[PDB]
Symmetry: C3
Subunit: 334 residues, 3 copies
């Protein structure tokens, strides 16, 4: 078809765990959605003791933003690489087709620009990440990854063909950092990434992470940044992982509907206490809360969650329901 | 509803891999089942060379007991913490709802008691484990975990809606121990857990286990403790893992029906040679034997199974069936 | 039944990633297919810097050959152990039944022979591997593993009951090597396996691989050995893993139909960007290409793929389709 006869929309993205405005049901025919992402290389502090790394990011955040479109639409991305950066970057969509998902067409040196249009033909959640030849793990484990959701034209549908509507939608990306440390057990610091490259390769070859974080920082979704909800509300959590397997868990709740691979053509699973999301993919979980309070959202490899920092929080407002769970006898001292 | 108008039952649990008496089909309406578990901190020897650790357990066993109830019943647990113990414990069900699955209501110091009632609303196998704030991985990888099964009111059903009945039911919990060892490669010994806490944290941060055991000891399900069966019998094996992914395998047999996540609302899978059970969940496998002999039950990460101790045995009585598998020519020396 | 009244066929296998001739639809009734595999212990060079190991193989290749049969057929294997070898070997099928999948009947010392007949009763892809008592991980991680496919009698069927036909079929086995290295970081070399056994056990207990390779060598499916195809062709990739979990990914394409556990009785999944294959099992992926060019086939634990060698290539002939993905603006220097 002649795409020049299709409408065009302009969308400017938000910083996670929030998503830009959208509509769960298509109001029009296929359009051409337009995004604009900027690359940024900056130092980050990821834990409490001020460990710093040289992160590379889309729009200056770990992870990148979530782009929501509809099926059979046209995505047109405008990737910009400013001059103060120093490396060659290129994007790669798991939703595109051919040319390494768009990686062979998007190579940009410092101080350059590129546009790319592709068609979103399959519904579901997908992952995008940088991919320069010879430095793929380094770029992707420094923080250059994100997700993209391609809704069906009629919104979600459970396994019985009945519709599904979510009041809120949150996005969580789990990032594993392999920071190199010396013989003294202290993390080493550098000037610019090129110096840290080789000991980064060594640390990665050790094959175990040093940090695992939600939203690029230990505690970034804890305290005053907790994710909020109300009893009876319907929430969709998208969870992405670009390099390592992860197993999300909502301490207190469950998974009402779960796409553990994130592809909406398949029927979902029901009543999941803990599902598995392979490395390099995204998944979706639909849950509607029943009791108020504070929920935890962890990676149920409990060592990673409570020693490397893969834990966030949920604050849900409401009042108790003492039929589901009550304390018959308060903790008593005999 | 007014629960005071519901029957009450008293159940006393057994030591695994055996389950207390129950009925796969509900004979009455919803009841209130009553369990009573006691906490015990004791030294354990987990391998052949007498490596000892400071295990913490429910009812003095690793893992804890399996509690079988029916859907939409009321579970009332009475947790007791004696005075000779020295830590603060609290239980946490993945089947409950709200208050961290019951963890915020069950904190008991040494020499205390607590009751808690909740409603079992979802059918399937779930995991329960200790969870004190700040020592969750330590408590859960010292041995404070177990499972709980919530049958449907009509018993199991395959993917074609036909019933399913098991003659035997066994329960297996896989436990990974990170015992700290010194520079000499020898495992270190202590007085009480508080001393071992910090090197335990270090060993856990190494992120690889030192032992992996079925029923809390290397060889605990081998030799005279092998699990017994007969040709044509129907067995349901429940398998639980609270912290690490595992992949069960029955060398010689298969999986006739498999709930790899352990939720009975979903249809099962068929003819599984090896399924995956994520960390922090339980799964169920229904198998009916055909040939007699000795079967192995391993974790098919063969290194873990045959070097760290994740292997058990099955003794099935009967006589051969030389149509399925025969030796046309005996091993001959040319 | 009396098998002596059934036809007999003779099949001689090929070296992977190619499969011997077969027919996706059964032309006759059940037969007795006859294979003959020879054991070979030889030195291998697995990477670019000439690291050598003492591999043990079926027919002198890593992995072994793929055997394609039909359901309810009779497989008759003739395993031969020559005299220049020095160890005791025995085969073990995950598709057989009883006697450890055939491991208790097939023990052969150097200079011996054995035949074994079993019935292929379940359709799907299965794994076979050596299994001598006490050296199972060593034998299986030195390279003694392969796969076997048991097609249904009517060929494959998608989830809507419609047939499925593949023009090409490729087979890929992922092998993880734990080569022992000294204090200097250099890989140690030996004379014969018996010497290397103990440091091999130590290296395996470290629990992280040193190499991960497709077809037993770094780059073995890259360059002039790339897997070939044409736009619009239909390919079935079988992927096997005997010891460790793996997550295949086709950079640029997708998975049109995926049996992630490899059992054809279950319905497949659709539009998989990355599926998970547990350790000790095989899986199947049906894909039909749309755009030409060079595709990568990686294990999407990107560190393993691009640092340990788990990557292969696809060359597909044809011409572009600028409706699916086009470059609106060539990379421009502002
Ligand atoms: Cu980059
Ligand atoms: Cu990728
Ligand atoms: Cu405890
Ligand atoms: Cu838990
Ligand atoms: Cu062998
Ligand atoms: Cu096996």
């Amino acid at each position: 078809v002649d795409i020049s006869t299709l409408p065009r929309v302009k969308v400017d993205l938000v910083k996670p765990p929030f998503v830009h405005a959208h509509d769960q049901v298509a109001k029009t025919g296929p359009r051409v959605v337009e995004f604009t992402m900027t690359i940024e290389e900056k130092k980050l502090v990821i834990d409490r003791e001020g460990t710093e790394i040289h992160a590379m990011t889309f729009n200056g955040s770990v992870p990148g933003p979530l782009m929501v479109v509809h099926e059979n639409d046209y995505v047109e991305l405008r990737l910009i690489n400013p001059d103060t950066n120093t490396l060659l970057h290129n994007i790669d969509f798991h939703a595109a087709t051919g040319a390494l998902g768009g990686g062979a067409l998007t190579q940009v040196n410092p101080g350059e620009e590129t546009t790319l249009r592709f068609k979103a033909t399959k519904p579901g959640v997908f992952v995008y990440h940088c991919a320069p030849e010879g430095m793929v793990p380094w770029h992707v484990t420094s923080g250059m990854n994100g997700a993209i959701m391609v809704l069906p034209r009629d919104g979600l549908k459970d396994e019985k063909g009945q519709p599904l509507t979510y009041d809120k939608i949150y996005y969580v990306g789990e990032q594993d950092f392999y920071v190199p440390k010396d013989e003294a057990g202290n993390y080493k610091k550098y000037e610019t990434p090129g110096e840290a490259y080789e000991d980064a390769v060594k640390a990665m070859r050790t094959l175990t992470p040093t940090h695992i974080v939600f939203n690029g920082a230990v505690g970034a979704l804890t305290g005053d940044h907790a994710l909020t909800a109300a009893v009876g509300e319907r929430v969709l959590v998208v969870h992405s992982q670009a390099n390592r397997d992860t197993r999300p868990h909502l301490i207190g709740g469950h998974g009402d509907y779960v796409w553990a691979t994130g592809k909406f053509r398949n029927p979902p699973d029901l009543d999941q206490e803990t599902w598995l999301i392979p490395g390099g993919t995204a998944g979706a979980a639909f849950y509607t809360f029943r009791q108020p309070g504070v929920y935890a959202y962890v990676n149920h490899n409990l060592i990673e969650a409570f020693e490397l920092g893969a834990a966030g929080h949920f604050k849900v407002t409401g009042e108790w329901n003492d039929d589901l769970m009550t304390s018959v006898v308060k903790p008593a001292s005999m």
